[model samples]
Target chain A: LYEEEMRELRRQVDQLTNDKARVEVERDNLAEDIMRLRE
Target chain B: SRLGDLYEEEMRELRRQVDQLTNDKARVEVERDNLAEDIMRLREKL
Candidate 1:
């Protein structure tokens, strides 16, 4: 039995990738804000 | 109402960043684990 399609796994990976990107953006923004506030 | 506010703000931002980084790192680890599990399952099926 081929439980679950391979496409589903790819979709999940894609979703996680998007989440990673968003977190990266947030991290960058926070870093910039910190720098601006420090200066 | 002076530099104290600014310092506190900076501290808050730093804490936020640390928290975010920790979350991101944990997610990354989970992602790796999932990938490994997928590979293993695929291999078993073959």
Candidate 2:
């Protein structure tokens, strides 16, 4: 039981980490856009 | 079996990491929304 739960949890973390990385990239792009707006 | 102890420790460690990642995911989503809002406001000014 513990082994199964651990595997599931690990998979969840992997998904979340991938999502975070994608969002962070979008965030960085938005920040750059803000700078362009000043021009 | 003493193996249960080992399994418990491993599971707990995974749980802890999972919890931390969940929190991080939430924080990133919030920040993304805020940045999107900023872009909207900037576009209005431009």
Candidate 3:
């Protein structure tokens, strides 16, 4: 059943969301690094 | 330059694919657990 423990689950979801965003940023940085190296 | 771009793009694409799969797996696991819990609760009530 949905309860206060759900808050922990939500926190986990938030953490995963943040992790995904960070990876995306890293991916963008990698792309930029490659672009700069090629230029 | 094009080859370099393609290489970088492909690398990122691969990473994205991996991330996508991982996220999907986590989500599915969470959903499965929730469903199991619901089933258990219902069984207890019955």
TM-score of chain A of each: 0.82, 0.85, 0.74
What is the lDDT, from 0 to 100, of the residue B25 in candidate 3?
55
Write out the backbone clash pairs for model 3. none
Q: Highest lDDT: give the candidate number.
A: 2
Measured against the true structure, the TM-scores of the candidates, in listed sequence, are 0.51, 0.84, 0.51
Report DockQ per prediction, comma-separated: 0.04, 0.76, 0.02
Runs in model 3 deviating more than 4 A are: A1-39
Report lDDT per candidate.
0.57, 0.83, 0.58
lDDT (10s digit) by residue, model 2, range A1-39: 655788888898788889888988988888787788776
Best by DockQ: 2
Q: Model 3: per-residue lDDT, tens digit, A1-39?
A: 333434544455566677666666555555555456446
Ranking by TM-score: 2, 1, 3
Worst lDDT run of 10 residues, candidate 3 chain B, spans B31-40
lDDT (Cα) of model 3: 0.58
lDDT of model 3, residue A20: 62
| DockQ value of candidate 2 | 0.76
Better by DockQ, candidate 2 or 1: 2
Q: List the residue pairs that clash in candidate 1.
A: none
